[PDB]
Design a protein around this ligand. Sequence first.
Ligand code: HEM
Ligand SMILES: O=C(O[C@H](Cn1ccnc1)c1ccc(F)cc1)c1cc(Cl)cc(Cl)c1
Length: 450
Amino acid sequence: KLPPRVPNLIPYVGSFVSFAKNPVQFIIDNSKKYGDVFTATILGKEMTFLNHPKILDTFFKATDNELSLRDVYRFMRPVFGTGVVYDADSTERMMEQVKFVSSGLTTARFRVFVDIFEDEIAHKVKELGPEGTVDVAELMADLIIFTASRCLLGDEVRQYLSEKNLGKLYHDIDDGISPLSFFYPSLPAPKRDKARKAVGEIFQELLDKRREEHKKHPERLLDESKMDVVDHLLTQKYKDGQELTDVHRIGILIAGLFAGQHTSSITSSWTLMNVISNKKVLEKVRKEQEEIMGSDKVLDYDKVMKMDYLEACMKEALRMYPPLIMIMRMARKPRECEQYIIPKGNILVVSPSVAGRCTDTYTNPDVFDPERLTERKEHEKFKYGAVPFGAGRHKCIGENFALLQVKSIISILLRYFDMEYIGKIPDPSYTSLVVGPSPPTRMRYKLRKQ
Ligand code: HEM
Ligand SMILES: O=C(O[C@H](Cn1ccnc1)c1ccc(F)cc1)c1cc(Cl)cc(Cl)c1
């Protein structure tokens, strides 16, 4: 019947301490001890970890009344908002809301986004000067905040960033959600709530402003390259004809931005760091750039679409250091897994971090080798060998945008600068919801064109 248990340190708390010490190592260690499927008590929750590629289809192809997302990620309600996303009234409503974000992520917008990336980096180079050292994680977070905001919200957001502290407000929301929220969703967090209200009022203002501009300039509606997520949200209704409330519009923008930022800034950090620290890798990347750029001096979309090796580097950083280390679902009915049955109420857990280091799937997995993908094709062994964007019904809809954003940023930065990373590549720090490199992450740079 039930899978093998990790014996608990204590009653209730169970395996929390070793889990909290390092959840990826926790799953590796215990998979060796107990197999492909084991269960653990963790601050009251029964958590069943699925750890081999071969068993993942049952997880990924379930429906939302078999394996529920809304039951596990509903603690995000104070960040994204009441009635939005995991706190939507239904699974169907949640799916429609996700479609509004995805509808500002079209090819047409992607061509405009490349120019945004060029513009923001040009502004950033003036702060950095011709030489120096900079924290990599912060540079990326700072660039991704301006770029993602303008990509999703339109250029009207830029004054609020540069003259109303919106970047700091985001960091206060990010500040007040920890992994413990998953276990205790009512842990009060008053600075987070203060910042969420502030961003709320700014986004309300942005919606009102946009309404005026849709009156005075209705042609924008026709032009697909100027239509951002704010615009769709103001002009689309739910499928059954119910109109959106501004509360929901606001929440959906906050959520989209939350997805738009942290995961990409972290991936960019890991990618850049490993690129510039491996001489061979850096040579191949620069040889592709020079071939694709030719005599042009700025990026455009079709150039970014030919950056295959740089794409493979990003993918390799996502194998090794996926920012979303664990994917979860609650069993609403018992579930068959292998010989076992997982019972109603257990949380199923799949980890892209664990998959990424599986010795089945990958050889020398602690080595950053983009050619493992580009030649040895190691990812395609199993159907679910690589899942840093998930799989199936709830696969990331931001994937192409993230690829575009991180390739572009790293390509532009390489065009401007020679860069050298200081010290050894860090380990992941398992202290936030979205997992990034352990500080410090510093690099030297110098401008290539005096
Ligand atoms: C490198 C950057 C990113 C990574 C690693 C990533 C990873 C993921 C993963 C693993 C999932 C599956 C979660 C699950 O099944 O429970 C997912 C879902 C999602 N991602 Fe991303 N993501 C990234 C960027 C983005 C961006 C830039 C956006 C939007 C701007 C976005 C929007 C979403 C949405 C809306 C879903 C939900 C899909 C659904 O449930 O239908 N993501 N992402
Ligand atoms: O930000 C979004 O999800 C991120 C995890 N994430 C980050 C990037 N891609 C996925 C997320 C999810 C659950 C958490 F508990 C914490 C963070 C998100 C999800 C949906 Cl369904 C809709 C929208 Cl608009 C945003």
